């Protein structure tokens, strides 16, 4: 929906402008996204999106249009300041979110080459548990940085200190995506893991 379309679109428009110096391409990504705003929100989530980001997106569009008439890059810079703020806020509900359950030592973090020793419980977004190392009564061990584990763990556990317990809420893009894991994880599943970093080996 609107959250995912704007997140993907802002990223791609920014790759075209900043990465490829292609203003026309960036415009052609942004303009349809603004156009679909104009019918108004039609779901509760689109309404929430509009309330949160509608005004800033409308202003960003106005700076873009000022740019087409001035050719002054300062007007585009003002547009992207707004688009980036919207992007960062949308991003807080995607990827992986780390919420501390109990603090760690705040000083010892995973480093390259080390093995993380953790306890975890994985649940679907509703709360149905699908796996737990705590049920096997033994810690799970893995290494970060080599795509051994889903992206939400790669990014989430890397931020935890030894002794920390944290809740990782992982969007499907950062977990098992459209395929899921047959027999365990459905397609397009947001996952919630209760993870405790026990030690580094």
Ligand X SMILES: CO[C@H]1C[C@@H]2CC[C@@H](C)[C@@](O)(O2)C(=O)C(=O)N2CCCC[C@H]2C(=O)O[C@H]([C@H](C)C[C@@H]2CC[C@@H](O)[C@H](OC)C2)CC(=O)[C@H](C)/C=C(\C)[C@@H](O)[C@@H](OC)C(=O)[C@H](C)C[C@H](C)/C=C/C=C/C=C/1C
Rule CB under 6 A: is residue 117 a binding residue for ligand X?
no
Token duo for residue 84: 């980036």
For position 153 contacting ligand X by CB under 6 A, the verdict is yes
Q: Please, which residue, 9 or 122, has the CB nearer to ligand X?
A: 122
Is residue 152 exposed (0-12), middle (13-18) or buried (19+ Cβ within 10 Å)? buried
The nearer residue to ligand X, 6 or 120, going by C-beta atoms, is: 120
Among 117, 149, 158, 200, binds ligand X (CB under 6 A): 149
Catalytic residue among 27, 130, 140, 142: 130
42 near ligand X, judged by CB under 6 A: no
**Residue whose C-alpha is closest to residue 65's, from 33, 40, 14, 31:** 31
Determine which residue in the list 14, 25, 140, 159 makes contact with ligand X, applying CB under 6 A. Answer: 140
Residues 14, 18, 21, 27: what is their CA dihedral angle, to the nearest 10 degrees? 20
Q: Which is nearer to ligand X, 73 or 101 (CB)?
A: 101
Query: 157 exposed, middle or buried (CB, 10 Å; 0-12, 13-18, 19+)?
Result: buried
Which residues in 163-183 are b (16+ Cβ under 10 Å) and which e? Answer: bbbbbbbbbbbbbbbeeeeee
Residue 180 is a binding residue for ligand X (CB under 6 A): no
Instruction: Say whether 67 is catalytic.
Output: no
Q: Is 84 a catalytic residue?
A: no
Applying CB under 6 A, which of residues 59, 131, 155, 194 lies at the interface with ligand X?
Answer: 131
Degrees (nearest 5) of the Cα angle 19, 24, 28?
A: 100
Is residue 134 close enough to count as binding ligand X by CB under 6 A?
no
Catalytic residue among 131, 140, 142, 194: 131
Q: How far is residue 157's CA from residue 126's CA, in Å, rounded to a whole number? A: 22
- The C-alpha atoms of residue 63 and residue 30 are separated, in whole angstroms, by 12
Minimum distance from residue 162 beta carbon to ligand X (Å): 18
Residue from the set 40, 107, 147, 201 that interacts with ligand X by CB under 6 A: 147
The residue with its CB nearest to ligand X is: 131
Catalytic site includes residue 120: yes
| 150 in active site | yes
Q: Which residues bind ligand X (CB under 6 A)?
A: 120, 122, 131, 140, 142, 147-150, 153, 181, 184-185
């Amino acid at each position: 929906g609107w959250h995912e379309m704007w997140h993907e679109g802002l990223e791609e428009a920014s790759r075209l402008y900043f990465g490829e110096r292609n203003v026309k391409g960036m415009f052609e990504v942004l303009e349809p996204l603004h156009a679909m705003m104009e019918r108004g929100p039609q779901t509760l989530k689109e309404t929430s999106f509009n309330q949160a980001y509608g005004r800033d997106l409308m202003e960003a569009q106005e700076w873009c249009r000022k740019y087409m008439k001035s050719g002054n890059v300062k007007d585009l810079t003002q547009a992207w300041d707004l688009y980036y703020h919207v992007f960062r806020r949308i991003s807080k509900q995607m990827g992986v979110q780390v919420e501390t359950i109990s603090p760690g030592d705040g000083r010892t973090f995973p480093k390259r080459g080390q093995t993380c020793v953790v306890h975890y419980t994985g649940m679907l977004e509703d709360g149905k548990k699908f796996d737990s190392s705590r049920d096997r009564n033994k810690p799970f061990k893995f290494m970060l940085g080599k795509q051994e584990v889903i992206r939400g763990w790669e990014e989430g556990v890397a931020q935890m200190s030894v002794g920390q317990r944290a809740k990782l809420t992982i969007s499907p893009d950062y977990a098992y995506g459209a395929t899921g894991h047959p027999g365990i994880i459905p397609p397009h599943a947001t996952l919630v893991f209760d993870v405790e970093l026990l030690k580094l080996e």
